[PDB]
Design a protein around this motif. Structure first.
Motif, PDB file in Angstrom:
ATOM      1  N   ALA A  62      47.595  55.223 -31.490  1.00 12.23           N
ATOM      2  CA  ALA A  62      46.394  54.709 -30.849  1.00 12.23           C
ATOM      3  C   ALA A  62      46.701  53.463 -30.030  1.00 12.23           C
ATOM      4  O   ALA A  62      45.792  52.781 -29.563  1.00 12.23           O
ATOM      5  CB  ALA A  62      45.326  54.408 -31.887  1.00 12.23           C
ATOM      6  N   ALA A  63      47.991  53.166 -29.862  1.00 14.23           N
ATOM      7  CA  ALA A  63      48.380  51.983 -29.103  1.00 14.23           C
ATOM      8  C   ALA A  63      48.026  52.135 -27.630  1.00 14.23           C
ATOM      9  O   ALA A  63      47.457  51.219 -27.021  1.00 14.23           O
ATOM     10  CB  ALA A  63      49.872  51.712 -29.280  1.00 14.23           C
TER      11      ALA A  63
ATOM     12  N   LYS B 105      48.258  63.600 -32.180  1.00 13.35           N
ATOM     13  CA  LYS B 105      48.451  63.057 -33.520  1.00 13.35           C
ATOM     14  C   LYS B 105      47.935  61.627 -33.631  1.00 13.35           C
ATOM     15  O   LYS B 105      47.355  61.251 -34.655  1.00 13.35           O
ATOM     16  CB  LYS B 105      49.927  63.117 -33.899  1.00 13.35           C
ATOM     17  CG  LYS B 105      50.205  62.766 -35.338  1.00 13.35           C
ATOM     18  CD  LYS B 105      51.690  62.753 -35.620  1.00 13.35           C
ATOM     19  CE  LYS B 105      52.088  61.510 -36.382  1.00 13.35           C
ATOM     20  NZ  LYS B 105      51.555  61.528 -37.767  1.00 13.35           N
ATOM     21  N   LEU B 106      48.138  60.817 -32.596  1.00 13.28           N
ATOM     22  CA  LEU B 106      47.745  59.417 -32.595  1.00 13.28           C
ATOM     23  C   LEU B 106      46.543  59.160 -31.694  1.00 13.28           C
ATOM     24  O   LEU B 106      46.427  58.085 -31.103  1.00 13.28           O
ATOM     25  CB  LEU B 106      48.914  58.533 -32.170  1.00 13.28           C
ATOM     26  CG  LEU B 106      50.291  58.815 -32.758  1.00 13.28           C
ATOM     27  CD1 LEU B 106      51.329  57.966 -32.057  1.00 13.28           C
ATOM     28  CD2 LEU B 106      50.312  58.569 -34.252  1.00 13.28           C
ATOM     29  N   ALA B 107      45.662  60.145 -31.554  1.00 11.67           N
ATOM     30  CA  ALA B 107      44.406  59.924 -30.853  1.00 11.67           C
ATOM     31  C   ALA B 107      43.653  58.756 -31.469  1.00 11.67           C
ATOM     32  O   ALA B 107      43.569  58.626 -32.691  1.00 11.67           O
ATOM     33  CB  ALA B 107      43.545  61.183 -30.903  1.00 11.67           C
ATOM     34  N   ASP B 108      43.120  57.891 -30.612  1.00 11.49           N
ATOM     35  CA  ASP B 108      42.325  56.766 -31.079  1.00 11.49           C
ATOM     36  C   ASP B 108      41.078  57.272 -31.790  1.00 11.49           C
ATOM     37  O   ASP B 108      40.210  57.892 -31.169  1.00 11.49           O
ATOM     38  CB  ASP B 108      41.951  55.856 -29.910  1.00 11.49           C
ATOM     39  CG  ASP B 108      41.533  54.471 -30.359  1.00 11.49           C
ATOM     40  OD1 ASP B 108      41.693  54.155 -31.552  1.00 11.49           O
ATOM     41  OD2 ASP B 108      41.042  53.695 -29.515  1.00 11.49           O
ATOM     42  N   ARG B 109      40.983  57.022 -33.090  1.00 12.61           N
ATOM     43  CA  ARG B 109      39.853  57.452 -33.899  1.00 12.61           C
ATOM     44  C   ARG B 109      38.729  56.432 -33.929  1.00 12.61           C
ATOM     45  O   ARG B 109      37.737  56.643 -34.626  1.00 12.61           O
ATOM     46  CB  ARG B 109      40.309  57.733 -35.329  1.00 12.61           C
ATOM     47  CG  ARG B 109      40.532  59.193 -35.629  1.00 12.61           C
ATOM     48  CD  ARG B 109      41.859  59.651 -35.088  1.00 12.61           C
ATOM     49  NE  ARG B 109      42.443  60.712 -35.892  1.00 12.61           N
ATOM     50  CZ  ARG B 109      43.702  61.117 -35.778  1.00 12.61           C
ATOM     51  NH1 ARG B 109      44.498  60.545 -34.892  1.00 12.61           N
ATOM     52  NH2 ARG B 109      44.161  62.088 -36.551  1.00 12.61           N
ATOM     53  N   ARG B 110      38.857  55.346 -33.184  1.00 13.04           N
ATOM     54  CA  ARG B 110      38.001  54.181 -33.334  1.00 13.04           C
ATOM     55  C   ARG B 110      36.931  54.191 -32.250  1.00 13.04           C
ATOM     56  O   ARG B 110      37.249  54.249 -31.060  1.00 13.04           O
ATOM     57  CB  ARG B 110      38.851  52.916 -33.263  1.00 13.04           C
ATOM     58  CG  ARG B 110      38.128  51.639 -33.529  1.00 13.04           C
ATOM     59  CD  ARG B 110      39.066  50.472 -33.341  1.00 13.04           C
ATOM     60  NE  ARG B 110      39.605  49.969 -34.596  1.00 13.04           N
ATOM     61  CZ  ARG B 110      40.734  49.282 -34.686  1.00 13.04           C
ATOM     62  NH1 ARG B 110      41.444  49.034 -33.595  1.00 13.04           N
ATOM     63  NH2 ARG B 110      41.161  48.851 -35.860  1.00 13.04           N
ATOM     64  N   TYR B 111      35.670  54.133 -32.665  1.00 19.23           N
ATOM     65  CA  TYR B 111      34.558  54.174 -31.725  1.00 19.23           C
ATOM     66  C   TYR B 111      34.472  52.873 -30.937  1.00 19.23           C
ATOM     67  O   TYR B 111      34.465  51.785 -31.514  1.00 19.23           O
ATOM     68  CB  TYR B 111      33.249  54.428 -32.475  1.00 19.23           C
ATOM     69  CG  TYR B 111      32.006  54.199 -31.643  1.00 19.23           C
ATOM     70  CD1 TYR B 111      31.523  55.182 -30.795  1.00 19.23           C
ATOM     71  CD2 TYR B 111      31.319  52.995 -31.700  1.00 19.23           C
ATOM     72  CE1 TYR B 111      30.402  54.975 -30.034  1.00 19.23           C
ATOM     73  CE2 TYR B 111      30.196  52.779 -30.937  1.00 19.23           C
ATOM     74  CZ  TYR B 111      29.742  53.771 -30.107  1.00 19.23           C
ATOM     75  OH  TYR B 111      28.618  53.561 -29.349  1.00 19.23           O
ATOM     76  N   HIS B 112      34.398  52.991 -29.619  1.00 17.10           N
ATOM     77  CA  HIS B 112      34.200  51.867 -28.721  1.00 17.10           C
ATOM     78  C   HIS B 112      32.852  52.010 -28.032  1.00 17.10           C
ATOM     79  O   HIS B 112      32.277  53.097 -27.974  1.00 17.10           O
ATOM     80  CB  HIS B 112      35.305  51.792 -27.666  1.00 17.10           C
ATOM     81  CG  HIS B 112      36.637  51.404 -28.216  1.00 17.10           C
ATOM     82  ND1 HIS B 112      37.629  52.321 -28.472  1.00 17.10           N
ATOM     83  CD2 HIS B 112      37.138  50.194 -28.562  1.00 17.10           C
ATOM     84  CE1 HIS B 112      38.688  51.695 -28.955  1.00 17.10           C
ATOM     85  NE2 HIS B 112      38.416  50.405 -29.018  1.00 17.10           N
ATOM     86  N   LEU B 113      32.349  50.896 -27.496  1.00 20.54           N
ATOM     87  CA  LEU B 113      31.121  50.954 -26.716  1.00 20.54           C
ATOM     88  C   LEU B 113      31.312  51.640 -25.373  1.00 20.54           C
ATOM     89  O   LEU B 113      30.320  51.927 -24.697  1.00 20.54           O
ATOM     90  CB  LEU B 113      30.553  49.556 -26.488  1.00 20.54           C
ATOM     91  CG  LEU B 113      29.980  48.854 -27.712  1.00 20.54           C
ATOM     92  CD1 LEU B 113      29.127  47.687 -27.280  1.00 20.54           C
ATOM     93  CD2 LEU B 113      29.187  49.818 -28.561  1.00 20.54           C
TER      94      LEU B 113
ATOM     95  N   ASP C 201      32.421  54.573 -25.287  1.00 20.32           N
ATOM     96  CA  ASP C 201      32.255  55.965 -25.672  1.00 20.32           C
ATOM     97  C   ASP C 201      30.814  56.440 -25.597  1.00 20.32           C
ATOM     98  O   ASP C 201      30.569  57.643 -25.715  1.00 20.32           O
ATOM     99  CB  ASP C 201      32.769  56.177 -27.100  1.00 20.32           C
ATOM    100  CG  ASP C 201      34.220  55.786 -27.261  1.00 20.32           C
ATOM    101  OD1 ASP C 201      34.718  55.796 -28.404  1.00 20.32           O
ATOM    102  OD2 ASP C 201      34.863  55.478 -26.237  1.00 20.32           O
TER     103      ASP C 201
ATOM    104  N   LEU D   4      27.740  60.301 -27.999  1.00 17.41           N
ATOM    105  CA  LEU D   4      29.113  60.803 -28.037  1.00 17.41           C
ATOM    106  C   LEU D   4      29.164  62.197 -27.415  1.00 17.41           C
ATOM    107  O   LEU D   4      29.288  63.229 -28.083  1.00 17.41           O
ATOM    108  CB  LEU D   4      29.643  60.777 -29.460  1.00 17.41           C
ATOM    109  CG  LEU D   4      29.695  59.352 -30.016  1.00 17.41           C
ATOM    110  CD1 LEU D   4      30.365  59.307 -31.358  1.00 17.41           C
ATOM    111  CD2 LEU D   4      30.413  58.457 -29.038  1.00 17.41           C
TER     112      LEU D   4
ATOM    113  N   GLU E 197      32.319  64.591 -27.687  1.00 14.80           N
ATOM    114  CA  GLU E 197      32.498  64.829 -29.109  1.00 14.80           C
ATOM    115  C   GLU E 197      31.531  65.874 -29.626  1.00 14.80           C
ATOM    116  O   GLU E 197      31.922  66.751 -30.398  1.00 14.80           O
ATOM    117  CB  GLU E 197      32.318  63.535 -29.907  1.00 14.80           C
ATOM    118  CG  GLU E 197      33.526  62.614 -29.907  1.00 14.80           C
ATOM    119  CD  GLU E 197      33.355  61.419 -28.983  1.00 14.80           C
ATOM    120  OE1 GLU E 197      32.916  61.604 -27.827  1.00 14.80           O
ATOM    121  OE2 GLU E 197      33.667  60.290 -29.414  1.00 14.80           O
TER     122      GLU E 197
END
Ligand SMILES: Cc1cc2nc3c(=O)[nH]c(=O)nc-3n(C[C@H](O)[C@H](O)[C@H](O)COP(=O)(O)OP(=O)(O)OC[C@H]3O[C@@H](n4cnc5c(N)ncnc54)[C@H](O)[C@@H]3O)c2cc1C
Ligand code: SF4
Ligand code: SF4
Ligand code: SF4
Ligand code: SF4
Ligand code: SF4
Ligand code: SF4
Ligand code: SF4
Ligand code: SF4
Ligand code: SF4
Ligand code: SF4
Ligand code: SF4
Ligand code: SF4
Ligand code: SF4
Ligand code: SF4
Ligand code: FES
Lengths: 77, 189, 662, 137, 79, 296, 252, 95
Positions: free
Chosen positions: B1-2, B13-21, B23, B74, B77
């Motif tokens: 997620a870097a 595999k390293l998709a950013d799982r973190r919700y941002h504004l 989004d 979302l 999603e």
């Protein structure tokens, strides 16, 4: 509301059973519809005016099925 | 997620799982509200809808999760989720929601947006083709014509199977919304 | 007349919407205006000093203040006008803040200025025609009435009596105590609910200043802050207290609570105190700890067999022919404490309350778990009498619900009492597990969060999901609870032996009838409304009536008692003084204009008008105490023979004329 | 050259409270209506309305409590009957009866008070100047 | 004061429910007839009960016992 | 004799014609007259077509409604999904003005207008109403008792739900359809979760057949456990699911039930004396012969 | 004097001790009484909420509910402060109505709207469009240049971590007994509760009086409460203090 | 989720997702409490742990979910999860 004064009126075969449930105490006024004769000496006497008289001739002749000679309001008894 | 690495399996595999504004799509939310005709932004995530769903115990479908995605905007999603087509529209969720929301109507609006972005199962397109051709989702065949005759009914029902002039009006209705022109294009692939 | 116009800026709240200088110059050029002037905060001490100095210097007849709302600052400026040598009622406001500035802020300035000039002109026109009024003082009867004998009613009655005021305690049921008498243990201290209540009930029963009238209702109320003529219905109890027996002539006494009557009575009926779980004869007491231990007779179910009188014997306490007696009582103030009932949760069909045997509600659970209840304190399943080992608690049952069936509000105490019941089952049945299906645990009060921590520590399972529906197993009668564990993220199917619904609460039965008798309005929620929701949660808009307890909104026993003592204090304020001043807005009949038609008499809701003899002519007579100043009669009378004291026709018509002046 | 002259007569206990609540909540509306503030709407005599209309009110508004919510138990039933009769009189003297209306605004309906203000202003603007002002001469 | 229901679908117009009712038989077959109202009359081939408000029946069962192809159900419970 | 336009959607005429034949015959035996709808089509099936486009759903349902409007008659239905489409679009377009406008300017391309003048009824709803044929009239019309048969009712979902949009009362445990089966003389039995969806709605039947069949199999297990000898239903979707899906369950899983699935109109015909050949019970996947042996 | 009534009130718990929310170290992190003064029209600003770091108007505001409350770690308070859910809803409404287009984010863990009309207030705030994220804030990072605040928690209902970047962060801090309150209650002989507030005679049936006769409690000094409950308690205490004065005798 | 079909791919696809009280292992919970020496049964699912985890933003690892599984006794759900070995033991959650 509140449930436990469960008033029920079931026709178990030939006996009409009128009931008042509690947790452990019941009350069963049981009318044997093969012996009733359709007199009203049960409706005249009811202190609480619950027993009413139904289709005496039809029931006593066998031509009525969904009723007894007498109807008792088991909520008032 | 870097950051984006452009190695597709590692990006997956390293998709950013973190919700941002960034989004949130308020336009998506407003379209859902308009199409569904329900107060979907008023969900407080009690879980009654999921607790009543018959699809939830046997799949990953979560109607409450779809409601949350609608509220947060979302898009991409909600629309791309393959468990958007597991709703049977049984309306139990709508029957029981304490906020008077129609989650199944939100699902229906989401399905319309998914079709407009070309995500749609093929049975839907095939039904569109059948209704365009004959006006009937489940059309008559020879064996049923024989069965109807042996019964005593006319070999065809009084519908557009026996009055083919109304089929043209049905086709104009469908063509006005371009449903056939999209269904055939999507089927071609 | 000489009028002074004082225009407040309200600290730029008004000067940022209009031109105060222009309003002031217009006021100066207005007719009758002696002085016009402005200040930043006219409600502050320099502002009152400015008013008083202007009055003294310019010999002002009246004062007009162009400021905030009258509903906000009539008392302030009326007192400022008094201090200065004027009558308080030579004063009139022009609301140019809440009806000019705050509504015409943006992009429209000369329009707001013109509106302000118009309002100031109308105010000056009225004030040039106002004249002197003196408020009416009425005596206050030194008694008080408390309707409701729950904890809030008992606390209010004890408070008033110990302050020294004679008090009437009206209770519709044969005993005082209320719901707290039905509670078994109390959150968060786990004290025996009945045990803590027993002393205060004894205090109420023994207090010489309290007239405890149980099994009695309020038929009608008329009057006002001074004297309330309250008519009570003394329902036929059927049994005589020792005092009443001695009065009627029976020396041997009345009822001593021996119990022989109910030992011989053959009728058996459900007990409403035990929520119907337990039998009671036709002659009965709710429980053994009722305060008047006097054994009511239930005349709707008595068959007049006469066995009870033979059992009572020489005590002769039973009078089977007793009838509803009516009594009229004059009181100064009244306190309403009607409490609450459980919302009918059988309407929510997805939780099979009436249709599945082993689904109960929280007051039935509290009676089942109490050691004085139908069971020996043993929680057993209603379906078969076996001990449960898994118990579910459906929180929010019918609450925070906008579907039209349940209540849209929180019932306040249902999260706390469900925690108490979970603790009670986990400590009384060894190995039993409590499941709480919750949606926002609300432990907000003192020690409530610690109680929540302790319950979780003892091992209650908290599943954050509102119950969707409940299915009954056909054979074991077990209940399958279906919801989603929202935190876990999966649907659940928890099979319990007993399901308890934490149902919402609603105003008691007949509470709306009683609050309409007393003139109290209702809230959006359906509870009784208070005078000011923030700074006056006890008093109502109708003077002399005060609220106490759950009748104003759901609350725990601590908050209920605080509210009850607050109401007792508010009801004592006018009784201790003995005087109270009414607002001089009364109707005054001008007799040599009255023609005696009598048509206005029926337009008064308060019956303040009547036809009487004055100088041979039949004219109308106003009971100035009963009048409330509405103005219906004076707006009716065709001949103008009724004068409204601060809103007279010449004054209102002068306002209209000034509006159309250009 | 023409600005509507609308006069409102609002009771103290629900309509004045509602207007005050609208002001407190900062609900904007055009500055065309000026209010009188009587205690109840039962106080409103017919001659008040007729006097306003003959002095030249382009419109008149009377605002009070909902039915069943009068501070004085039943004072707005009397006002409602009076205003029904006033509507009939204005129609039969040939003045446009939609220059007059009676709204029921509760103490908590500041938004509804703002909407009433806007709608009264719009209706009177459509109707135009009252005819009495030129019929007098 | 009971309630009688006639299954119009299998009524043949036999008129043996009209002739056999002892309340119908009051008018012409009694000395000094008391009441002359009638429960049934066969209009258009099926028995119509004029006793709409259930005031004259006495649950006798003469009419239920009379109809040859059972078609009259007698209700002994309040309507 | 009340007269209704008979909508007759897709599955009853083209897969289970005995359902429509018995509908006409039994409705005529009771006091109801079912008139053919002239050129009606698929009610735009609420799942498989509403999921795609709500506007064309509205337009096609409105066209179906205005056919009967020109006929000047009230629609009568025998399908819960068709009820959803027809009745609900009728109800929505009787109250929503901008949707009326949109549908009307779509329909104006085919010289056709919606004004909202008729009402939509389910045939079982008519059979239950007292003004129209009631339960007592059904009992009167029944001539073969059908006694000694345990029969499980499937209500479906689109007739009764959501209860905030319909007028049939309680959705948690209705008993009205159980009274219609009791009128026929067959004893209706109660099974676990009787109000569960059959799984065919919303296009799931087509999109994920295994998911839909698992939902159906949960019901079939409960019904067999209760002890039913047939499953009555008021929907050709649900009948198709319970009928085909038993075969697909037998092949995709290893579960055998052999429980006949019959529309209520087919049972009413059997009660009123219609023949199995005249009902075309040979067109069902699951043989009805054991049930016929029991009730005949 | 004959009787005494104690009404010492409360202060805000020192939330700079919770270092993960950079209260004193980040400019644009404030607490709820500072926010109430900033939003008041009589405050240091002209009623305009502006960012302390640069004086610009915020467009995203976060509300950290439970800040230092229901906390058993020894730094915060183990109790609920009662009114912080309600005042955070009020502040969210105020920002959404005073700054056009501004969005309020409430990071919450049990919304507690229990009083009269409170649930309706909660419904109305959600309707006006405050975002309710059920997750206790984990930590707050400050962007070095824009001075914006990155709030890190998990959306427990959504099931994913979040990183909401706001212009202004408001901490709904716990309340504690005022400064010097323990000194005053020791002067009067009153004891303390487990929570640290003044103790009442009987927790259920006597929430105003204390064990020492002639001393009565009123207000937040006995435990946190809203202005309605505080006023009811105050009048109850006044009544209890009047009981012996009106009699003029009291029996020891 | 109707029952066991013994067709492994269909069993995987229609695995019962619904938590039952037969799924709880109190022995598993007690072993966890003993070995961890922490009050794990007192979690009230605030999400602070997951909000602080450095493994959560890049994987499906949810420490709060593991805490919930511990509380509910979901042995064979916690132990077989391949995201049990993505904890770096950075102790931010504990902090
Ligand atoms: C299941 C349950 C458990 C609870 N547990 C707790 C607990 O553990 N701790 C706690 O603090 N709180 C608890 N509560 C809340 C508690 O019961 C209330 O705070 C409290 O009873 C309020 O008392 P009240 O006097 O206002 O009303 P009530 O107790 O209802 O008293 C009202 C009284 O007025 C009488 N009355 C009503 N109408 C009239 C009329 N028209 N005329 C005359 N008399 C009338 C009624 O008969 C009754 O006696 C619980 C509530 C419930 C439902
Ligand atoms: S009618 Fe009554 S009194 Fe007569 S036999 Fe029957 S039960 Fe006895
Ligand atoms: S039932 Fe309604 S309120 Fe509850 S989660 Fe579903 S949509 Fe939201
Ligand atoms: S309508 Fe869809 S989401 Fe709602 S309960 Fe039925 S299947 Fe689930
Ligand atoms: S009197 Fe009213 S307007 Fe003037 S300063 Fe005071 S509050 Fe403001
Ligand atoms: S027998 Fe007489 S004295 Fe004894 S309890 Fe009964 S009524 Fe009272
Ligand atoms: S008269 Fe008879 S029924 Fe009535 S209370 Fe006495 S013993 Fe009981
Ligand atoms: S107190 Fe708790 S259980 Fe009761 S309504 Fe409020 S949130 Fe629900
Ligand atoms: S005051 Fe007026 S209405 Fe009343 S009696 Fe006199 S003339 Fe008649
Ligand atoms: S103003 Fe007139 S009608 Fe109103 S209370 Fe007074 S006397 Fe009665
Ligand atoms: S029961 Fe007797 S009285 Fe009644 S209709 Fe039949 S025959 Fe006539
Ligand atoms: S006796 Fe029977 S068949 Fe004959 S008319 Fe009467 S109801 Fe009809
Ligand atoms: S009132 Fe709300 S924000 Fe304040 S401590 Fe309690 S739960 Fe947290
Ligand atoms: S373990 Fe995680 S979710 Fe549970 S209380 Fe601690 S930080 Fe919150
Ligand atoms: S120790 Fe670090 S990596 Fe492991 S769960 Fe806690 S925060 Fe996440
Ligand atoms: S108090 Fe407003 S209309 Fe009467």
């Amino acid at each position: 509301s509140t449930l436990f004064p469960k008033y029920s009126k079931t026709t178990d075969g030939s006996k009409v059973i009128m009931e008042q449930r509690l947790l452990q105490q019941v009350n069963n006024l049981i009318l044997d519809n093969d012996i009733c004769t359709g007199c009203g000496i049960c409706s005249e006497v009811c202190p609480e005016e619950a027993i009413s008289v139904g289709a005496v001739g039809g029931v006593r002749r066998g031509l009525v099925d969904d009723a007894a000679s007498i109807h008792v309001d088991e909520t008032k008894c | 997620a870097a950051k984006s690495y452009n190695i597709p399996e590692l990006d997956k595999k390293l998709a950013d799982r973190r919700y941002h504004l960034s989004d949130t799509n308020p336009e998506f939310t407003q379209k859902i509200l308009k199409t569904s005709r329900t107060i979907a932004n008023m969900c407080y995530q009690c879980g009654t809808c999921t607790g009543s769903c018959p699809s939830a115990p046997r799949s990953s479908y979560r109607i409450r999760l779809f409601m949350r995605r609608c509220v947060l905007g979302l898009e991409n999603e909600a629309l791309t989720d393959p468990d958007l087509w597991l709703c049977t529209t049984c309306y139990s969720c709508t029957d029981r929601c304490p906020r008077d929301i129609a989650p199944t109507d939100v699902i229906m609006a989401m399905r319309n947006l998914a079709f407009k972005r070309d995500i749609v199962p093929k049975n839907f397109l095939q039904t569109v083709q059948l209704i365009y051709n004959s006006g009937h989702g489940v059309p008559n065949n020879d064996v049923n014509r024989a069965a109807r005759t042996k019964l005593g009914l006319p070999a065809d029902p009084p519908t557009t199977h026996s009055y083919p002039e109304f089929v043209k009006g049905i086709q104009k209705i469908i063509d006005h919304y371009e449903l056939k022109e999209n269904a055939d294009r999507i089927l071609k692939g | 007349p000489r009028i002074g116009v004082f225009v407040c800026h309200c600290g730029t709240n008004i000067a940022g919407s209009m031109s105060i200088d222009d309003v002031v110059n217009y006021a100066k050029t207005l007719p009758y205006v002696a002085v016009a002037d402005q200040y930043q905060y006219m409600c502050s001490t320099p502002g009152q000093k400015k008013i008083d100095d202007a009055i003294k210097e310019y010999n002002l007849t009246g004062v007009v203040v162009a400021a905030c709302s009258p509903r906000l600052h009539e008392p302030t400026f009326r007192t400022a006008t008094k201090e200065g040598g004027l009558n308080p009622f030579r004063f009139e406001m022009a609301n140019i803040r809440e009806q000019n500035s705050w509504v015409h802020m943006h992009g429209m300035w000369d329009e707001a200025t013109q509106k302000a000039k118009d309002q100031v002109r109308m105010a000056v026109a009225k004030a040039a025609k106002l004249e002197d009024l003196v408020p009416k003082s009425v005596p206050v009867e030194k008694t008080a009435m408390v309707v409701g004998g729950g904890v809030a009613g008992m606390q209010a009655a004890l408070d008033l009596a110990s302050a020294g005021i004679k008090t009437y305690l009206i209770e519709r049921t044969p005993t005082i105590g209320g719901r707290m008498s039905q509670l078994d243990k109390t959150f968060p201290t786990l004290d025996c609910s009945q045990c803590i209540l027993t002393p205060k009930m004894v205090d109420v029963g023994r207090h010489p200043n309290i007239e405890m009238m149980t099994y009695t209702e309020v038929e009608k109320v008329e009057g006002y802050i001074g004297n309330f003529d309250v008519t009570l219905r003394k329902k036929a109890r059927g049994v005589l207290t020792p005092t009443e027996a001695t009065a009627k002539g029976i020396v041997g006494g009345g009822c001593n609570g021996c119990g022989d009557c109910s030992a011989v009575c053959p009728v058996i009926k459900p007990n409403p105190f035990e929520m119907g779980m337990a039998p009671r004869k036709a002659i009965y007491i709710y429980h053994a700890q009722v305060m008047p231990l006097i054994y009511t007779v239930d005349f709707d179910s008595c068959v007049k067999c006469g066995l009870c009188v033979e059992a009572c014997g020489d005590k002769k306490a039973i009078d089977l022919e007793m009838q509803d007696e009516f009594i009229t009582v004059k009181v100064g103030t009244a306190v309403l404490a009607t409490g609450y009932e459980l919302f009918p949760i059988e309407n929510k069909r997805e939780w099979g309350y009436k249709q599945f045997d082993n689904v109960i509600n929280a007051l039935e659970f509290e009676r089942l778990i109490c050691a004085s209840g139908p069971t020996g304190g043993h929680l057993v399943r209603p379906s078969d009498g076996k001990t449960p080992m898994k118990v579910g608690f459906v929180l929010c049952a019918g609450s925070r619900d906008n579907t039209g069936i349940g209540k849209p509000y929180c019932s306040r105490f249902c999260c706390m009492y469900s925690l108490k019941h979970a603790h009670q089952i986990m400590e009384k049945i060894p190995g039993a597990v409590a499941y709480l299906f919750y949606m926002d645990i609300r432990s907000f009060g003192k020690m409530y969060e610690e109680f929540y921590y302790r319950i979780q520590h003892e091992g209650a399972k908290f599943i954050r999901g509102r119950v969707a529906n409940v299915l009954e197993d056909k054979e074991t009668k077990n209940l399958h609870v279906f919801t989603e564990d929202t935190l876990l993220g999966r649907p659940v199917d928890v099979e319990v032996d007993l399901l308890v619904l934490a149902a919402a609460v609603q105003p008691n039965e007949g509470a709306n009838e009683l609050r309409k008798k007393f003139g109290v309005s209702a809230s959006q929620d359906g509870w009784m409304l208070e005078a000011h929701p923030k700074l006056n949660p006890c008093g109502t808009t109708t003077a002399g009536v005060f609220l106490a307890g759950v009748c104003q909104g759901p609350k725990d026993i601590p908050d209920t008692v605080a509210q009850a003592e607050g109401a007792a204090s508010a009801a004592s304020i006018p009784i201790h003084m003995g005087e109270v001043e009414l607002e001089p807005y009364f109707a005054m009949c001008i007799d040599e204009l009255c023609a005696g038609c009598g048509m206005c008499v029926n337009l008064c809701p308060y019956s303040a008008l009547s036809l009487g003899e004055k100088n041979g002519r039949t004219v109308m007579v106003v009971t100035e105490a009963k009048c409330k100043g509405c103005g219906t009669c004076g707006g009716f009378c065709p001949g103008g023979a009724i004068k409204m004291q601060h809103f007279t026709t010449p004054q209102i018509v002068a306002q209209i004329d000034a509006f159309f002046a250009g | 050259d023409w600005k509507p002259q609308i006069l409102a007569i609002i009771c103290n206990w629900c309509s004045y409270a509602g207007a005050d609540l609208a002001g407190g909540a900062r609900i904007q509306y055009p500055p065309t209506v000026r209010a009188i503030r009587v205690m109840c709407t039962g106080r409103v005599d017919m001659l008040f309305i007729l006097k306003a209309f003959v002095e030249g009110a382009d419109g008149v508004l009377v605002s009070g409590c909902h039915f069943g919510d009068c501070h004085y138990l039943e004072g707005n039933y009397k006002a409602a009957k009076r205003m029904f009769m006033i509507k009939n009189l204005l129609r039969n003297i040939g003045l446009d009866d939609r220059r007059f209306r009676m709204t029921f605004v509760s103490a908590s309906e500041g938004a509804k008070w703002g909407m009433v203000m806007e709608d009264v202003t719009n209706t009177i603007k459509e109707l135009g100047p009252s005819p009495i002002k030129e019929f007098k001469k | 004061a009971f309630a009688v229901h006639v299954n119009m679908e299998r009524c043949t117009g036999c008129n043996n429910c009209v002739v056999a009712c002892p309340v119908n038989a009051l008018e012409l077959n009694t000395v000094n007839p008391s009441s002359t109202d009638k429960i049934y009359k066969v209009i258009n081939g099926d028995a119509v009960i004029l006793d709409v408000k259930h005031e004259l029946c006495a649950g006798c069962g003469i009419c239920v016992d009379a109809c040859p192809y059972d078609v009259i159900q007698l209700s002994g419970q309040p309507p | 004799m009340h007269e209704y336009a008979f909508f007759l959607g897709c599955i009853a005429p083209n897969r289970y014609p005995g359902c429509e034949a018995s509908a006409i015959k039994t409705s005529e035996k009771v006091g109801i007259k079912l008139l053919p709808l002239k050129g009606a089509s698929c009610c735009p099936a609420p799942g498989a077509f509403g999921s795609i486009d709500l506007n064309v759903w509205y337009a096609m349902a409105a066209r179906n409604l205005v056919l009967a409007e020109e006929m000047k008659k009230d629609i009568a239905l025998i399908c819960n999904g068709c009820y959803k489409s027809i009745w609900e679009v009728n109800h929505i377009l009787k109250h929503n003005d901008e949707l009326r406008d949109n549908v009307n300017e779509v329909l104006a391309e085919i010289d056709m207008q919606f004004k909202g003048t008729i009402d939509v009824w389910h045939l079982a709803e008519l059979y239950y109403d007292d003004k129209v044929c009631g339960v007592q009239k059904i009992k009167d019309s029944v001539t073969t008792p059908l006694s000694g048969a345990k029969v499980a009712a499937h209500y479906g979902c689109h007739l009764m739900k959501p209860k905030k949009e319909r007028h049939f009362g309680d959705t948690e445990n209705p008993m009205w359809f159980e009274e219609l089966i009791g009128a026929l003389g067959a004893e209706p039995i109660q099974y676990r979760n009787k109000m569960q969806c059959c799984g065919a709605g919303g296009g799931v039947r087509g999109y994920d057949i295994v998911h839909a069949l698992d939902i159906t199999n949960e019901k079939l297990i409960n019904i067999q456990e209760a002890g039913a000898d047939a499953i009555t239903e008021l929907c050709p979707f649900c009948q198709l699911q319970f009928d085909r899906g038993q075969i697909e369950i037998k092949e995709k899983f290893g579960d055998v039930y052999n429980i006949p699935v019959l529309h209520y109109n087919e049972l009413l015909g059997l009660a009123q004396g219609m023949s199995p050949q005249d009902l075309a019970l040979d067109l069902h996947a699951i043989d009805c012969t054991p049930f016929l042996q029991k009730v005949l």
